[PDB]
Amino acid sequence: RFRKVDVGEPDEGEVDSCLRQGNMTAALQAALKNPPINTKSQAVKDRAGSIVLKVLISFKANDIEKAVQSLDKNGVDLLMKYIYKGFESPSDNSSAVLLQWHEKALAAGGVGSIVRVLTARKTV
């Protein structure tokens, strides 16, 4: 008894238009414009993450160099925050390609880019 009690207590139309135009490099940059990391809601996060994934899986594997090196370092770190989000929702195809995007963003951003995923107080 005497010690029982608890006490002392993204623009989907812009992305679609870029993909349907085939402007793949801009389609990535279009997705990375305005991340809802500032925003409290969950649905807008899963929305934004799904829109980013739509680009990554529709990217051709050989072009990931031209994709990732186009981004600025603040973009490359944001790409990493979206990559580690994709792995939380496996599928037949998604993990096989996200693991490749990871290794090219790793060359661009380095291990320090991953620390700014672990340490960020905001979920993208």
Binding site: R1, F2, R3, K4, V5, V7, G8
Partner: protein
């Protein structure tokens, strides 16, 4: 020192450690264990050219213990062998340490509360009939820690080596009918730690081993803050298993024993002491005091002595006092508990707050009349 040039020594003769220095000092000179030992031959340990005297005392006896039978001259605050205590005092005032000409000194002793009568009588005797001190006093553990804290009101929770005492004092008035003794203290936690290390397959049995397991305790043991989460941590993960190196170089692994052993202070039945733990025994002391004094006692819980130094004891003791108060006084008004004001005074210097208190008192009263028992007033 005194105006007459008389040195004013202050001297705690604990069952664990002698702590003996001059009045007005902020630190004790010369901490050493209250130990006596005698040379023996063991067939299993190396002998060398280190000279072992026919009797050794104190610090030297504790470090050469590997070739000594060793004895603690005092237990539970009671002198067991007056001959070994004479030797320990002879070392204390001796050339090894306080090299005082005792016949010219004033000495402040202390005595535990509610101690046996003839113990004090024979202590006061030897000070005038063998050391010939120029003046004596026998201070009380409770008031001394209050001088070291500068307070006039509080409940002292003096947890030494041999025994633990709770002593209320209110505005300088004593409340001796509220004194409570708890038989668990640091010597029994060490006996208990031995009994647990035996269950992991180690062995500790010789007199020299008792001091080694004491140092294991002081290094590794801690009071769990929330015993359920400590047990969960030990079962879920290996992180508590921490190594130690015996003087023989044998490595031992210490695990959940680190918190099981101190826990006897809060669940006395674990060492077959019948009663209630220090937190509840303290609470039952406050609730016995006159009704309006209670709200001051909760604001001045004062800890003292080395067996309080376990990491987390103040934090744990706060938690239980709050749970006791919510259970028994507020009847579950968990919102109203937020108004409960409780302070556990946990100065890091508290390991020596008794001696520090005596050095304050003797410096305040070095030259006054009615304080010191003089050898002129003795022998009548």
């Amino acid at each position: 020192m005194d105006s007459q040039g008389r040195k004013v020594v202050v001297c705690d003769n604990g069952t664990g450690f002698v702590k003996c220095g001059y009045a007005g000092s902020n630190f004790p000179e010369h901490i050493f264990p209250a130990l006596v030992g005698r040379p023996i031959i063991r067939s299993t340990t190396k002998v060398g050219n280190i000279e072992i005297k026919d009797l050794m005392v104190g610090d030297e006896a504790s470090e050469l213990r590997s070739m000594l039978e060793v004895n603690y001259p005092m237990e539970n605050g009671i002198v067991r062998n007056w001959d070994d205590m004479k030797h320990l005092w002879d070392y204390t005032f001796g050339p090894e340490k306080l090299n005082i000409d005792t016949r010219n000194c004033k000495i402040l002793l202390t005595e535990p509360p509610m101690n046996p009568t003839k113990n004090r009588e024979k202590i006061v005797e030897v000070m005038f009939e063998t050391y010939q001190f120029s003046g004596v006093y026998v201070a009380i553990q409770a008031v001394l820690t209050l001088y070291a804290q500068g307070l006039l009101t509080g409940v002292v929770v003096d947890s030494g080596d041999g025994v633990t005492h709770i002593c209320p004092v209110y505005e300088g008035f004593s409340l001796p009918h509220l004194t409570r003794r708890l038989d668990i203290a640091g010597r029994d936690i060490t006996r208990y730690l031995i009994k647990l290390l035996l269950l992991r397959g180690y062995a500790f049995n010789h007199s020299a081993d008792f001091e080694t397991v004491r140092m294991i305790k002081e290094k590794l043991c801690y009071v769990g803050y929330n015993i359920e989460q400590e047990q969960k941590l030990a079962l879920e993960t290996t992180v508590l298993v921490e190594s130690y190196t015996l003087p023989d170089g044998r490595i031992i692994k210490v695990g959940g024993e680190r918190f099981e052993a101190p826990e006897a202070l809060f669940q006395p039945h674990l060492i077959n002491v019948e009663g209630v733990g220090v937190a509840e025994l303290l609470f039952n002391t406050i609730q016995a005091a006159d009704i309006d004094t209670r709200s001051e006692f909760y604001k001045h819980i004062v800890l003292s002595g080395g067996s309080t130094m376990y990491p987390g004891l103040p934090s744990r003791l706060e938690r239980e006092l709050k749970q006791l108060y919510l259970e028994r006084v507020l009847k579950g008004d968990v919102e109203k508990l937020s108004k409960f004001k409780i302070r556990i005074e946990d100065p890091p210097r508290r390991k020596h707050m008794v001696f520090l208190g005596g050095a304050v008192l003797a410096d305040i009263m070095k030259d006054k009349d009615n304080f010191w028992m003089t050898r002129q007033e003795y022998q009548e």
